[PDB]
């Protein structure tokens, strides 16, 4: 049932196309590839981890040690346990992850409908040949601020203007 994990990982690969320059995330999938490809050859490589006391003990006619190391294996038959010790730290990492995730998920869901609303407002409110500059002063006091500062300094030249809007004069 590992194929669901790997399918969602390649789904995030074709989604990590959208973020070029992945530092160690694909390297984290490389580390899970490393030990997951290691564990399958580890489980297929081994024999049944026991001394075959039926055939392979009756081979040695002068036995004297096979019951000894047989008892040594059955001594260490409770071999050593693993660790699912992480129940305090791993919940903290998924807590930070789910926090940032829900923040981003709700934020982009808001920002999509805000830009859809901006698109709908943009479609019906372009009076582009009849807008009053008083309405532009009313929508931006930056207009009057820059104009007044421009007269107070005296930079009657408007820079960046002549390129897209012609000088239009006689000379």
């Amino acid at each position: 049932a590992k194929s669901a994990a790997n399918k969602l990982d390649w789904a995030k690969v074709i989604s990590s196309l959208r973020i070029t320059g992945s530092t160690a995330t694909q390297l984290s999938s490389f580390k899970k590839r490393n030990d997951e490809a290691r564990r399958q050859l580890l489980e297929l490589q081994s024999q049944p981890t026991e001394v075959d006391f039926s055939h392979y003990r009756s081979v040695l006619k002068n036995t004297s040690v096979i019951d000894k190391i047989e008892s040594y294996v059955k001594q260490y038959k409770p071999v050593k346990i693993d660790a699912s010790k992480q129940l305090q730290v791993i919940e903290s990492f998924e807590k930070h992850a789910m926090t940032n995730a829900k923040e981003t998920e709700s934020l982009v869901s808001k920002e999509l409908k805000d830009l859809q609303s901006t698109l709908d407002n943009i479609q019906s409110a372009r009076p582009f040949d009849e807008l009053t500059v008083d309405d532009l002063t009313k929508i931006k006091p930056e207009i009057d601020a820059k104009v007044e500062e421009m007269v107070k300094k005296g930079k009657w030249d408007v820079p960046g203007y002549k390129d897209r809007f012609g000088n239009l004069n006689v000379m």
């Binding site: 790997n6 694909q26 590839r33 490809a37």
Partner: protein, 363 residues
């Protein structure tokens, strides 16, 4: 099929149970390693339970050193082939009629497995020293020599040897015996008097040319020369579905082999075929003692055929092999079991395999 476990052999020159195939080559050019890898590949079924899928190996060393046969027995006990191996040794210290006899007695050993329903592979190695022993026995009895001083019946010797190996039908018990004689030529020659008698018996050649092993491409099968005559009717169905272009594509790449040495700028199609041909030539390399089963030979060749490799640099392909294999062993294990059981790619299998390629190809 006789799944040799090599990539290029089962890709290009397949071997049927009862099809006498020749491994011809030169001195120290990797001749013995093909037969040794085939014997080690038969561990897939010799551990199994069905008799009609087991395949017993009889390796018949003639004219070789004692210590070479000693190391080869040590090799076939490292990888545990000696529960099904039979070594008939006629080492070059011992005198000539032993070498004249030993492959025939080993063919009797093979016929015992043939008449009794089971299937068995035999490897003669190498009959160019058997004809040495036969020209010694016929130049000590005053029988006058023929062309290049092999005596005039030396065609008949390899005839009466290799003709005791075919596929018995159901009337006798459906047993078999398949032979791989090995012929040591002299400097890439295929037209002395001895290698134009083994070729005129066996059902095809695997011409292990020295120049390709000099470039390290081991095993060094020359694709445009190595052909088999009744191989194609007995390949695994899957490889025959996904390598019906591969022989013709390597013929295509061999056409433009000497045309690209001019260094001239060319069109797009020859560059595409040149890149895919170099990826396939670097792809068919293989280390010693690692035969790949057909269940893993299908996806690697499948990645080679359909242009998926073309974004990879040429040096990464050797580790691409083990990486893509471990990618399929960890995740898409069910596809490998499908290729194992069915032995054939249906449309759904093909689409799932294309997805599983393009996944790992994408990174």
């Amino acid at each position: 099929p006789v799944q040799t476990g090599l990539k290029a052999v089962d890709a290009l020159v397949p071997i049927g149970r009862g099809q006498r195939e020749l491994i011809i080559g030169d001195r120290q050019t990797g001749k013995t390693a093909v037969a040794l890898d085939t014997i080690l590949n038969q561990k897939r079924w010799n551990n199994g339970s069905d008799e009609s899928k087991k395949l017993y190996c009889v390796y018949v060393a003639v004219g070789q050193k004692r210590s070479t046969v000693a190391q080869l027995v040590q090799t076939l006990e490292q990888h545990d082939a000696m529960k099904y191996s039979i070594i008939v040794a006629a080492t070059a210290s011992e005198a000539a009629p032993l070498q004249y006899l030993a492959p025939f007695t080993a063919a009797s050993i093979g016929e015992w497995f043939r008449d009794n329903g089971k299937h068995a592979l035999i490897v003669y190695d190498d009959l160019s020293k058997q004809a040495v022993a036969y020209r010694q026995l016929s130049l000590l009895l005053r029988r006058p020599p023929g062309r290049e001083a092999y005596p005039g019946d030396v065609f008949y010797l390899h005839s009466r040897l290799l003709e005791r190996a075919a596929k018995l039908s159901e009337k006798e018990g459906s047993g078999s015996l398949t032979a791989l004689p090995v012929i040591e030529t002299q400097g890439g020659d295929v037209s002395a008097y001895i290698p134009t008698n083994v070729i005129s018996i066996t059902d095809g050649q695997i011409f292990l040319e020295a120049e390709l092993f000099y470039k390290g491409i081991r095993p060094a099968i020359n694709v445009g020369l190595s052909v088999s005559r009744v191989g194609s009717a007995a390949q695994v169905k899957a490889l025959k579905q996904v390598a019906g272009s591969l022989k013709l594509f390597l013929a295509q790449y061999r056409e433009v082999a000497a045309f690209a040495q001019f260094g001239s700028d060319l069109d797009a199609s020859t560059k595409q075929t040149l890149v895919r041909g170099e990826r396939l030539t670097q792809l068919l390399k293989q280390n010693q003692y690692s035969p790949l089963a057909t269940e893993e030979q299908v996806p690697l060749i499948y990645a080679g055929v359909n242009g998926h490799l073309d974004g990879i640099e040429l040096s990464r392909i050797g580790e691409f092999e083990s990486s893509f294999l471990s990618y399929l062993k960890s995740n898409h294990n069910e596809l490998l079991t499908e290729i194992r059981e069915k032995g054939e790619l249906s449309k759904e299998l093909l689409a799932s395999l294309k997805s599983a390629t393009e996944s790992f190809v994408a990174t």
